[PDB]
Amino acid sequence: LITENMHMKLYMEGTVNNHHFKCTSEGEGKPYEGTQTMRIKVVEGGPLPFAFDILATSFSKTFINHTQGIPDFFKQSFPEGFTWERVTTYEDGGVLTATQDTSLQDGCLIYNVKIRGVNFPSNGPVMQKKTLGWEACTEMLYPADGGLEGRADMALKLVGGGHLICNLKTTYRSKKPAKNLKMPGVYYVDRRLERIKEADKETYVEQHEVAVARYCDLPSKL
């Protein structure tokens, strides 16, 4: 069901600090190679009065290269699909909750996302639009009651050269019955999420991700 080349379509809506917005996107990737591109339009509420960077991780788990024979919870979940829900907490107080549904319809991946961001500081780099994209990061995934949890800290680059850190807590849930899933143990996903293009003080954005799943590649004593 998951071919070597796949397309995706996405619908996103929500609010950040009482600012309403809506996006749509389409893209393609190579799910077994862990690469993908999404071309995103802000269609309502734009240009956004906050940094688009805080929405970046809300635009795709089917496109992770699961190496070393790690069971692939995401690719296994089709045709039924899967969901994820995340709370991202910024060190200066912003909190952004994202809820997502992933389905497969007529050979295309379909994403539906709802966003609720609150308490971003009015004078901070997010609301002031003083961000410059994300550093690479490693997410740890681990089984927890029939689904997976993920944890990562990400660093947001800032105008002037500093960083603002946030913490991501995600739960990934399959729509496939447990009986039909081979669960992985604990593992890690290295990611590089990059902005390739922006047009119109950020109403059009192209993003690229490469994502590779691995175990810890250090020798063990146990």
Side-chain angles (χ1 to χ4, degrees), residues 1 15 63 102 115-116 139 158 164 172 176 209:
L1 257 14
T15 58
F63 300 80
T102 297
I115 302 290
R116 204 66 73 194
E139 186 188 16
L158 304 182
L164 172 61
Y172 304 97
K176 196 187 218 83
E209 183 178 308

Short mmCIF file of all heavy atoms in Angstrom, two decimals, residues 1 15 63 102 115-116 139 158 164 172 176 209:
data_model
loop_
_atom_site.label_atom_id
_atom_site.label_comp_id
_atom_site.label_asym_id
_atom_site.label_seq_id
_atom_site.Cartn_x
_atom_site.Cartn_y
_atom_site.Cartn_z
N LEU A 1 0.84 -1.20 0.00
CA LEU A 1 0.00 0.00 0.00
C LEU A 1 0.87 1.25 0.00
O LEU A 1 0.50 2.29 -0.56
CB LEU A 1 -0.91 0.02 1.23
CG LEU A 1 -2.39 -0.35 1.07
CD1 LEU A 1 -2.66 -1.00 -0.27
CD2 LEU A 1 -2.83 -1.24 2.21
N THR A 15 -5.73 28.03 15.80
CA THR A 15 -5.43 29.35 16.32
C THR A 15 -4.13 29.32 17.12
O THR A 15 -3.81 28.32 17.77
CB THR A 15 -6.57 29.88 17.23
OG1 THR A 15 -6.79 28.98 18.33
CG2 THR A 15 -7.87 30.03 16.45
N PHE A 63 6.96 8.68 6.10
CA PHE A 63 8.22 8.91 5.38
C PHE A 63 9.47 8.86 6.26
O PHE A 63 10.31 9.76 6.22
CB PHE A 63 8.15 10.23 4.61
CG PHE A 63 7.05 10.28 3.60
CD1 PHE A 63 5.74 10.55 3.99
CD2 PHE A 63 7.31 10.05 2.25
CE1 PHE A 63 4.71 10.61 3.05
CE2 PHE A 63 6.29 10.10 1.31
CZ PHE A 63 4.99 10.37 1.71
N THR A 102 -4.08 10.59 9.95
CA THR A 102 -3.48 10.13 8.71
C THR A 102 -4.27 8.99 8.10
O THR A 102 -4.46 7.95 8.73
CB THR A 102 -2.02 9.67 8.92
OG1 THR A 102 -1.23 10.78 9.36
CG2 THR A 102 -1.43 9.11 7.63
N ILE A 115 -4.75 22.74 15.18
CA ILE A 115 -3.68 23.38 15.95
C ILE A 115 -4.26 24.33 17.00
O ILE A 115 -5.15 25.13 16.71
CB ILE A 115 -2.79 24.27 15.01
CG1 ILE A 115 -2.19 23.44 13.87
CG2 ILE A 115 -1.73 25.01 15.83
CD1 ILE A 115 -1.11 22.45 14.31
N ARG A 116 -3.76 24.25 18.23
CA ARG A 116 -4.12 25.23 19.25
C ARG A 116 -2.87 25.70 19.99
O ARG A 116 -2.33 24.96 20.81
CB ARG A 116 -5.10 24.64 20.27
CG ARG A 116 -5.94 25.68 20.96
CD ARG A 116 -6.88 26.39 19.96
NE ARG A 116 -7.99 25.54 19.53
CZ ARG A 116 -8.79 25.78 18.49
NH1 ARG A 116 -8.61 26.85 17.72
NH2 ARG A 116 -9.77 24.93 18.20
N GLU A 139 14.53 12.17 17.80
CA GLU A 139 13.34 11.84 18.59
C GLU A 139 13.52 10.42 19.11
O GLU A 139 13.96 9.55 18.37
CB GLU A 139 12.06 11.93 17.75
CG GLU A 139 10.77 11.75 18.55
CD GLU A 139 9.51 11.63 17.69
OE1 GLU A 139 9.65 11.39 16.47
OE2 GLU A 139 8.39 11.77 18.23
N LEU A 158 17.45 31.72 15.98
CA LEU A 158 16.91 33.06 16.18
C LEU A 158 17.73 34.11 15.44
O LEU A 158 18.94 33.97 15.28
CB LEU A 158 16.88 33.41 17.66
CG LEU A 158 16.14 32.48 18.60
CD1 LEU A 158 16.19 33.05 20.03
CD2 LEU A 158 14.69 32.31 18.14
N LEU A 164 16.02 29.22 20.74
CA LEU A 164 14.95 29.00 21.70
C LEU A 164 14.58 27.52 21.63
O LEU A 164 14.34 27.00 20.54
CB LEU A 164 13.73 29.87 21.38
CG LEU A 164 12.45 29.61 22.19
CD1 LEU A 164 12.65 29.84 23.70
CD2 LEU A 164 11.27 30.46 21.65
N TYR A 172 1.47 8.36 19.35
CA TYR A 172 1.16 7.87 18.02
C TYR A 172 0.25 6.65 18.20
O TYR A 172 0.58 5.72 18.96
CB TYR A 172 2.44 7.50 17.26
CG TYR A 172 3.45 8.63 17.15
CD1 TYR A 172 4.52 8.71 18.02
CD2 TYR A 172 3.32 9.61 16.15
CE1 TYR A 172 5.45 9.75 17.91
CE2 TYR A 172 4.22 10.63 16.03
CZ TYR A 172 5.28 10.70 16.92
OH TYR A 172 6.18 11.74 16.79
N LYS A 176 -5.11 0.33 13.18
CA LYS A 176 -5.05 -1.12 12.96
C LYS A 176 -5.11 -1.83 14.30
O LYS A 176 -4.51 -1.38 15.26
CB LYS A 176 -3.75 -1.49 12.24
CG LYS A 176 -3.73 -2.88 11.63
CD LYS A 176 -2.34 -3.21 11.11
CE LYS A 176 -2.41 -3.99 9.80
NZ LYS A 176 -2.59 -3.10 8.62
N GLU A 209 12.07 17.30 4.46
CA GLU A 209 12.54 16.55 5.62
C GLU A 209 13.27 15.30 5.16
O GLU A 209 12.87 14.68 4.18
CB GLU A 209 11.37 16.16 6.53
CG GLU A 209 11.78 15.43 7.82
CD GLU A 209 10.59 15.09 8.72
OE1 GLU A 209 9.79 16.01 9.03
OE2 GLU A 209 10.44 13.92 9.11
#
